[model samples]
Target chain A: SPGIWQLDCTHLEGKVILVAVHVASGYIEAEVIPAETGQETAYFLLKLAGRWPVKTVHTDNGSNFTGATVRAACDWAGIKQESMNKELKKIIGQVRDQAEHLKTAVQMAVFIHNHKRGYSAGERIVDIIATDI
Target chain B: SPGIWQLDCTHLEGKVILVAVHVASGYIEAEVIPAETGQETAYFLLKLAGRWPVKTVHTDNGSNFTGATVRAACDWAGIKQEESMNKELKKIIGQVRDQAEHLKTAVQMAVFIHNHKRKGYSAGERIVDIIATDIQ
Candidate 1:
């Protein structure tokens, strides 16, 4: 599963970041976004899939995910589109609330969450992917 | 169980709306909000519990509920704060999306369904009656 995560400007020291997380592998990819707008969000979803074979893509009810363009992309790609629920969603929420060094902070958290034997394959996230995750 | 629901300006014709819903009874209390802000969200929690009991409040992960003030409200209300899995909310999402051009028509149709056909989980009657019985 691939899902969206938000990062505010504080710790990032610049434009807010939006990340796409791989749920099963505990991997993450991110970049600065222009105003959290839907057009950018759709583009993110469209482009993020270039690295992996995505069967499903998830997001919140933000205008970007709700708009017709994103839906159209999912339909064309044959990737099922879905929304994130509340609990795990906090992973993204906290990024906006408390990431003192947003981008780096997120990368570190993903590294730990995957390595704690509580995530994918019960081993380090990188080890599970058998490569850089 | 009680849950939070998001309502955007498109259907509402103005600022976004946020609602707290009773899962089993299908009762709802709603308010207009500012970009899904946390402070107003916390205040909405306080009032929603004034008439009825708010055992728990469900939400999205946006700063709307993670801040100190909202956290305190949940703690003081002796109310649990939780998030939506969206399983219970999806039906509403589908309803509105499918009837975008005629929102009032959709609302009326949904009201009729809830008031007549949507049976309570185990109360053996409809939600409309379940709530009405409380007042009468």
Candidate 2:
């Protein structure tokens, strides 16, 4: 099945970071947003869509996701938009709260979260195919 | 002096409860919103304005407070809107995650508990109770 992905926002060094998680594979993508507006968030969403089989864009009530700009982006990309609730917010919350190095610190934590191999899928998240041939 | 109020949303029994607190007096107002939209939140803000001397409203990034409807409500009501960093207080208030038999009543109960007997306030006097009495 093409996996559903969830997008959530958290703070890092007073900057907004958009984090995406692939539900089936448990893959993660995170980036610090220079501008936390709807357009910026939509750009990140499109970026994730380009890299993965984003069946649905699950998100919270943040304006960055709810605004018209992102809605149009989803429509143009032929992707469904939806809502979600995740504990990953808390995970990123703590990570950002404790990090002294800001951007690099968050990247390190995301790398650890992805590479830890909690489940032996024989294929890691990065190995998943966006579509079956 | 009339105080600024910090408004935040928390969950209780699967309901969205809007909690407002007077920054200076420590007075609290909690109500369960059947519709958690910008218009609904604006109505609540107006109701609070009618009841209390609301100087300014401090809110987080929730769209319920940021949309055009609530922004117009603030402009018409003459109450300035500002963003906040009140996660500490919100964390404490959320512990009241402690019901919907009349969900609003339960919210009032929790706010009353914090008002009457908060764990870490500066004084022993029921600050909110005093404000409640004076406002009436």
Candidate 3:
């Protein structure tokens, strides 16, 4: 029940949107960040902490979510979350060149997601952590 | 295990994109309809019938989705009822008149890929494959 969802950042032109998803529900949530930074990921996670009621967590492992400051702050907030997969990033390949377009392509994708094909608890990922599955 | 899902159509500069999503999870159904004929909604529902099995369907209620023909079809199809509780599949891309069709193409593609990747990244070392999606 406390498994960490996949986490990562993707760009719409150079702007970033942070992604946090719960595979348990096939649900996801994303937020725009001015830029990808340790503090921002920390800030994002902290905000999620309040919503998820997450006390201790596991994220990805690796060069994927690479920021020692974010790692510390992420833990400081309440957090493996080391390697978020690249599958999340490929959705933007079609329009990666159009960054100033306001809506990050990733946000467009995540919004449609975290919702599901069936009816059941834990189906909507957004329902968890105060938003989508 | 079956419940009514929210379904609706939203317009983009007069172009229409029919949208549907389940409440329990965010699995989605999306399509771009450039039809002037009256049967677009039926085609949309017909397409959906192939992918998802319907039981006690709870699609949104609007004269558009709930119109006489659709309702008749729904009844014959066995849709017990409908409701529109503001289903949030995802936000369609913002666009303008100049390139609206091109924009809707992106919208459809975005919805398709988002659902495709809805399954969160696997932690285990499962070999990944990149299959080309049919974007007809």
* lDDT (Cα, 0-100) at A79 in candidate 1: 61
lDDT of 2 by residue, B1-136 (tens): 4447888887656778787877765656666778689876876775565434466888886878778877865775568876142344345445543421344443443444444453654211333333334444
What DockQ does candidate 2 score?
0.01
* lDDT tens digits by residue: candidate 2, A69-126: 6786577455787511254444556655543445544553454454344442213432
For residues A17-131, what per-residue lDDT tens digits would candidate 3 score against the true structure?
A: 7777655654455666787666566656644543343344445453535776567645644464432235446544543353334344453344223222344222333233233
lDDT sort, best first: 2, 3, 1
Which segments of candidate 3 are over 4 A away from where they belong?
Answer: A1-133, B1-3, B35-38, B66-68, B83-101, B117-136
**Which pairs clash (backbone N, Cα, C closer than 3 Å) in model 2?**
none
Q: What is the lDDT of residue B82 in candidate 1?
A: 53
Question: lDDT of each structure?
Answer: 0.45, 0.58, 0.46
- Measured against the true structure, the TM-scores of the candidates, in listed sequence, are 0.32, 0.40, 0.37
Ranking of models by TM-score? 2, 3, 1
What TM-score does model 3 score on chain A?
0.59
Taking the tens digit of each residue's C-alpha lDDT, what string does model 1 give over A1-133? 2222332122144566665556664444454555676555555554444223356765655565777866765664456754212322345455445434344344333333333333332132223232322
* Candidate 1 lDDT score at position A3: 27
